[PDB]
Amino acid sequence: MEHVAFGSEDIENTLAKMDDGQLDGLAFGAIQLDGDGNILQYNAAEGDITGRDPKQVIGKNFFKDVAPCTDSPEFYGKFKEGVASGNLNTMFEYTFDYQMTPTKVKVHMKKALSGDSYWVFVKRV
Ligand SMILES: *C(=O)/C=C\c1ccc(O)cc1
């Protein structure tokens, strides 16, 4: 396992050194996005929540294609305001119900170390 705690204060620094393989070792769901909503990375722990197959979503748009539930001021509204402001760091509970059993999660969104990339972290509550 990759020993990194969900919500860590320097998680962006840590996850910068990892590759596709290493991100599969985390105890929580991790998704990388560009500033538009396209998925750049998707770890196996996230797949173990949504029934989604990582390889088949990478390149698709999160808010438009993959996960319509997040297309809301409560989720997508925060992302866009962060992508706009040049900073994002927020944690909240959400429910995923698209093509899946309604599942309650804790979500964490934080700007990455790179310029136009954002992290979405998911865990069960
Ligand atoms: C509503 O958000 C639907 C779905 C969904 C699919 C994949 C991931 O990673 C989160 C949420």
Curated annotation (Swiss-Prot):
Signal peptide: none annotated. GO terms for biological process: phototransduction; regulation of DNA-templated transcription. Keywords: Chromophore, Photoreceptor protein, Receptor, Sensory transduction. Disulfide bonds: none annotated. The 4-hydroxycinnamic acid (p-coumaric acid) chromophore is covalently bound via a thioester linkage. The keyword Repressor does not apply. One of its GO terms (molecular function) is identical protein binding. Monomer. Belongs to the photoactive yellow protein family. Photoactive blue light protein. Probably functions as a photoreceptor for a negative phototaxis response. This is Photoactive yellow protein. It comes from Halorhodospira halophila (Ectothiorhodospira halophila).
